[PDB]
Write a protein that holds these residues in place. Structure first.
Motif, mmCIF file in Angstrom:
data_model
loop_
_atom_site.group_PDB
_atom_site.id
_atom_site.type_symbol
_atom_site.label_atom_id
_atom_site.label_comp_id
_atom_site.label_asym_id
_atom_site.label_seq_id
_atom_site.Cartn_x
_atom_site.Cartn_y
_atom_site.Cartn_z
ATOM 1 N N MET A 291 34.070 38.412 36.961
ATOM 2 C CA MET A 291 33.579 39.456 37.847
ATOM 3 C C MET A 291 34.451 39.603 39.090
ATOM 4 O O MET A 291 34.036 40.254 40.055
ATOM 5 C CB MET A 291 32.119 39.204 38.254
ATOM 6 C CG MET A 291 31.057 39.587 37.203
ATOM 7 S SD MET A 291 31.434 39.387 35.440
ATOM 8 C CE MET A 291 31.647 37.613 35.273
ATOM 9 N N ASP A 292 35.633 38.988 39.097
ATOM 10 C CA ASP A 292 36.682 39.266 40.074
ATOM 11 C C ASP A 292 36.286 38.851 41.488
ATOM 12 O O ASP A 292 36.762 39.426 42.470
ATOM 13 C CB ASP A 292 37.072 40.746 40.042
ATOM 14 C CG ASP A 292 37.561 41.184 38.680
ATOM 15 O OD1 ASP A 292 37.610 40.336 37.767
ATOM 16 O OD2 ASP A 292 37.886 42.379 38.516
ATOM 17 N N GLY A 293 35.424 37.844 41.610
ATOM 18 C CA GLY A 293 35.060 37.363 42.929
ATOM 19 C C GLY A 293 36.237 36.780 43.678
ATOM 20 O O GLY A 293 36.462 37.096 44.845
ATOM 21 N N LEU A 294 37.002 35.931 43.015
ATOM 22 C CA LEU A 294 38.192 35.364 43.620
ATOM 23 C C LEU A 294 39.145 36.479 44.022
ATOM 24 O O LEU A 294 39.399 37.402 43.243
ATOM 25 C CB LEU A 294 38.870 34.412 42.641
ATOM 26 C CG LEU A 294 37.992 33.283 42.113
ATOM 27 C CD1 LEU A 294 38.302 33.010 40.646
ATOM 28 C CD2 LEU A 294 38.183 32.034 42.935
ATOM 29 N N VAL A 295 39.664 36.402 45.241
ATOM 30 C CA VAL A 295 40.536 37.427 45.790
ATOM 31 C C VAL A 295 41.738 36.747 46.414
ATOM 32 O O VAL A 295 41.584 35.802 47.190
ATOM 33 C CB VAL A 295 39.816 38.289 46.833
ATOM 34 C CG1 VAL A 295 40.603 39.533 47.073
ATOM 35 C CG2 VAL A 295 38.407 38.602 46.381
#
Length: 103
Positions: A12-16
RNA sequence: ACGGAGGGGUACCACCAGACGUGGAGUCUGCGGCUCAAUCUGACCCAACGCGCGCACCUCACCAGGCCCGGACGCGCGGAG
């Protein structure tokens, strides 16, 4: 003992990752923890953010290279395993948060 | 198969007896030629010529000009500094 959790987050692309994206994510006040590089050529990218985070919950892994593949950012074969191709990130920020065992 | 050969049959896309027409003019439409940047093309006796089911845009192919990649999927390299 922390890798186990990040796998679902990135789906879910939380890491940025990235200087221009990490900055803006924290300044909106919507972050849980952040990470850094073992080192870097200029403090600015390191000592600028550290105050902006202390002034506004940090860690540090002596292996800046783990921060790359732990955050996806890796090329693999169509048949599992991997290319052993990793881009060396430097900072990541957890938004959704969707570890708790380690802290 | 053909016969300006013979012998038997048949039909208004043949004739007899008749009827109504076309080819005469204006006009609608299609067909060759001329012109144009383009005047997109198929079909040529019966067995091509309102036929390929109504063309200002689309339909649309041709003329003069401009956006976009909507390059699937594999290998090598690069990339979040």
């Amino acid at each position: 003992f922390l890798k186990e959790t990040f796998k679902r987050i990135h789906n879910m692309d939380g890491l940025v990752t990235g200087h221009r994206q990490v900055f803006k994510y924290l300044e909106r006040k919507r972050a849980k923890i952040c990470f850094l590089a073992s080192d870097c050529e200029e403090k600015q990218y390191a000592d600028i953010v550290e105050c902006l985070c202390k002034e506004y919950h940090l860690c540090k892994k002596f292996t800046r290279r783990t921060l790359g593949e732990l955050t996806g950012q890796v090329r693999c074969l169509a048949d599992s395993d991997k290319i052993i191709k990793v881009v060396p990130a430097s900072a990541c920020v957890i938004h959704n948060f969707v570890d708790v065992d380690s802290f």
